[PDB]
Enzyme design. Structure first.
Site, PDB file in Angstrom:
ATOM      1  N   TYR A  97       0.850  -1.198   0.000  1.00 28.99           N
ATOM      2  CA  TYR A  97       0.000   0.000   0.000  1.00 28.99           C
ATOM      3  C   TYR A  97       0.881   1.242   0.000  1.00 28.99           C
ATOM      4  CZ  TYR A  97      -3.012   3.760   1.671  1.00 28.99           C
ATOM      5  OH  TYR A  97      -3.653   4.963   1.792  1.00 28.99           O
TER       6      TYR A  97
ATOM      7  N   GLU B  78      -4.154   7.018  -3.418  1.00 29.22           N
ATOM      8  CA  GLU B  78      -3.867   5.715  -2.906  1.00 29.22           C
ATOM      9  C   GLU B  78      -3.489   4.845  -4.103  1.00 29.22           C
ATOM     10  OE1 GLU B  78      -7.574   3.661  -1.244  1.00 29.22           O
ATOM     11  OE2 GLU B  78      -6.357   4.188   0.440  1.00 29.22           O
TER      12      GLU B  78
END
Ligand SMILES: CC(C)(COP(=O)(O)OP(=O)(O)OC[C@H]1O[C@@H](n2cnc3c(N)ncnc32)[C@H](O)[C@@H]1OP(=O)(O)O)[C@@H](O)C(=O)NCCC(=O)NCCS
Ligand SMILES: [Mg+2]
Lengths: 293, 387
Positions: free
Chosen positions: B110, B198
């Site tokens: 991530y 993101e």
């Protein structure tokens, strides 16, 4: 009172524009000393029987102004803010809505070693009722008194002003810190000033969804503010992940809810109301202040 | 403003990040043709909507032929996709992306960033837990979220990205590729006025390449005046029709599920009004900020936005007139009501500048407007109007 009074000399950036003109006329009528303003390209003219300058440096040299209010459109606000920060003016009020977040991030960082306070952007400004108004708030609802007010909103602030006026308490100074994610002046800065102001006998803190500023202010109050603080938080009913008008009024990552703000006031022993109609009334209960009028 | 997956990838690629590349198709034949253009045994077809949860909803399919691709595109294009992150109407699918296959991979990371409001700094977040909702990770195992606060003067430095790369257990060329990924993301963040991004997953492929597989970028809409190429990416089909319409009339509108509509000047006061309505037993149906100097025309559009909801059974107008006179505002409200089908009780609270002359004009307009004194009075009366 704090930051502004009858001796404050105010310049207007965007003086010749529609809102600069209108709010400056009102300010002059109210008793604010507007000493002139800046609009690039109109230097050497007059407006509302005051001098217009091309640059803040010229304006400040001519007038010895110590405050400035900005009515320039969002694209030019970062430029205008740095200009006035560099000029020797100590207090800057930014009314303008729509300033990019990253522009205020840089401005706020630039301020860290400067001797300049910036209120806003996206705010109604600052008023010391009976003395000086810088911004767009209506003078006539205010009354010189003893309640200091800090708020992230515009018209919601006017309800607390209306309620404290009607109860006969009136206002010392009301500071609209504005609706944006990174204000130039945060709640703690404003609480420090009001805590130190003998005219302020009690403080109202108005907030809303988004950020953790009210929680941080709560923790600061617990240890550092002796005057009674009454809180109120708008946006209990707001849906998550949605901008509620103001850029900073948004719940995201399940954080910035109204309830966690009330709960923080709880934990810090700070009094609050859940009804916007009862701000003054809650203050009355907490202070024990009374007047048959 | 949100970007489509393919737009976010195109943007990040332009700053030197590696992406799972695809081709956008607006019809099933174009989708079939994309599959053949990619020239791989497998492709992944993905509905292009501003939402997560696309796969769970049937909007992400692996395919092995042009024929399968046409079938999938035909199934998706021209229907709305409802995901766990959309409202009940879902988002229109006007296009699919046909993407190259980059799996299998070694691992998934991530990487993201926000403007952190407490620190007032751009802040990056990274984790070994790619392909997990990062909110769950944050809540359950906060220690697995690595954070880097960026100093505005110096920006993100290679050493800060290396600190993260080492804590993620990257090795070899993965470290320098991850560093270049984070540095490029930072440059994009500032240069494009991102509000947040993101990348999840950020895949470490078997050959060590660091690849953006799925990515979201939310731009600061208030900065789009200085980014013409980003403003040109805007997909209005993904925006709520009423929110968009309100924006075109200098209104700010959000729908809720409730039965009392609200019309207020100022965002703080609009949320406070919604809140006191609920305190007094009502269910706010909407947020609506009419701004300053609400004209007849603007109040008409506000009425139409509110009443388009059949569930609305009463309206509260709450306006605090400061610089604008209350009797002038009452005039505009009356003129507006006369042009609209107003089928429900309307409670009107007008305060501030000439509240008295305004309240009287309302009382004598012969439109059955219910005048209210304070905020408490207004809430009480609008809930009571439901019967
Ligand atoms: C700031 C705002 C008020 C300006 O709107 P406006 O007064 O209609 O705009 P105008 O274009 O008429 O006037 C702006 C002036 O700025 C001037 N200006 C532009 N750049 C400038 C600069 N760097 N320095 C000084 N003045 C400048 C312009 O030249 C113009 O003056 P002019 O018309 O004589 O040329 C508007 O953009 C805005 O933000 N409105 C919302 C405010 C709000 O709701 N705030 C929150 C309240 S709680
Ligand atoms: Mg506003």
């Amino acid at each position: 009172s704090v930051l502004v009074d009858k001796n404050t000399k105010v310049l207007v950036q965007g003086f010749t524009g529609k809102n600069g003109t209108f709010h400056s006329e009102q300010a002059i009528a109210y008793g604010t000393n507007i000493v002139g303003g800046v609009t690039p390209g109109k230097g050497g003219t007059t407006h509302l029987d005051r001098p217009v300058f091309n640059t803040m440096a010229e304006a400040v040299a001519a007038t010895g102004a110590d405050a400035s209010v900005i009515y320039v459109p969002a694209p030019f606000v970062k430029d205008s803010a740095i200009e006035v920060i560099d000029s020797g003016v100590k207090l800057v009020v930014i009314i303008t809505e729509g300033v990019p977040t990253l522009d205020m991030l840089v401005v706020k960082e630039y301020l860290k070693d400067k001797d300049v306070r910036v209120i806003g952007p996206n705010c109604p400004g600052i008023i010391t009722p009976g003395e000086c108004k810088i911004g767009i708030m209506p003078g006539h609802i205010h009354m010189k008194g003893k309640v200091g007010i800090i708020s992230r909103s515009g018209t919601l602030t006017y309800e607390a002003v209306a309620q404290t006026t009607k109860l006969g308490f009136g206002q010392s100074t009301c500071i609209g810190i504005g609706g944006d994610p990174i204000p130039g002046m945060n709640q703690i800065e404003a609480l420090k000033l009001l805590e130190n102001d003998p005219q302020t006998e009690a403080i109202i803190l108005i907030g809303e969804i988004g950020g953790t500023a009210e929680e941080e202010a709560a923790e600061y109050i617990k240890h550092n503010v002796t005057k009674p603080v009454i809180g109120y938080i708008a946006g209990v009913t707001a849906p998550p992940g949605k901008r509620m008008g103001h850029a900073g009024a948004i719940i995201s990552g399940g954080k910035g809810t109204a309830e966690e703000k009330f709960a923080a006031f709880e934990a810090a022993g700070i009094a609050y109301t859940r009804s916007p109609a009862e701000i003054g009334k809650k203050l009355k209960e907490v202070t024990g202040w009374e007047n048959l009028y | 403003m949100n970007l489509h997956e393919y737009q976010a990838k195109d943007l990040l690629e332009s700053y030197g990040l590696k992406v799972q590349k695809g081709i956008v198709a607006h019809n099933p034949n174009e989708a079939a043709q994309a599959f053949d253009q990619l020239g791989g045994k497998f492709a992944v077809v993905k509905a292009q909507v501003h939402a997560g949860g696309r796969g769970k909803a049937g909007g992400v399919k692996v395919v092995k032929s042009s024929q399968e691709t046409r079938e999938v595109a035909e199934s998706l294009i021209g229907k709305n996709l409802v995901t766990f992150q959309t409202d009940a109407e879902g988002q229109p699918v006007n296009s699919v992306g046909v993407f190259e296959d980059v799996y299998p991979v070694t691992r998934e990371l991530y990487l993201g960033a926000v403007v952190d409001r407490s620190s007032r700094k751009v802040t990056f977040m990274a984790s070994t837990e790619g392909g997990v909702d990062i909110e769950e990770v944050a809540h359950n195992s906060p220690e697995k979220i690595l954070k880097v606060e960026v100093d505005p003067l110096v920006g993100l430095q290679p050493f800060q990205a290396r600190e993260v790369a080492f804590k993620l257990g990257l090795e070899g060329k993965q470290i320098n590729d991850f560093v270049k990924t984070m540095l490029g993301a930072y440059k994009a963040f500032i240069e494009c006025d991102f509000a947040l991004f993101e990348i999840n997953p950020l895949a470490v492929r078997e050959n060590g390449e660091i690849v953006c597989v799925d990515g979201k970028i939310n731009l600061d809409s208030n900065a789009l005046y200085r980014h013409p190429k980003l403003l040109a990416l805007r997909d209005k089909s993904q925006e709520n029709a009423k929110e968009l319409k309100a924006s075109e009339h200098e209104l700010n509108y959000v729908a809720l599920e409730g039965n009392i509509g609200c019309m207020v000047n100022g965002a703080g006061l609009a949320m406070a009004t919604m809140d006191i309505i609920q305190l007094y037993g009502g269910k706010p149906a909407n947020f609506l900020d009419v701004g300053g100097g609400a004209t007849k025309e603007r109040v008409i559009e506000a009425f139409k936005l509110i009443l388009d909801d059949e569930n609305v059974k009463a309206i509260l107008i709450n306006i605090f007139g400061g610089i604008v006179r209350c009797d002038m505002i009452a005039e505009a409200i009356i003129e507006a009501v006369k042009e609209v089908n107003v089928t429900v009780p309307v409670v009107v609270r007008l305060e501030g500048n000439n509240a008295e002359k305004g309240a009287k004009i309302l009382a004598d307009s012969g439109l059955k407007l219910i005048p209210a004194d304070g905020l408490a009075d207004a809430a009480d009366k609008v809930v009571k109007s439901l019967g």
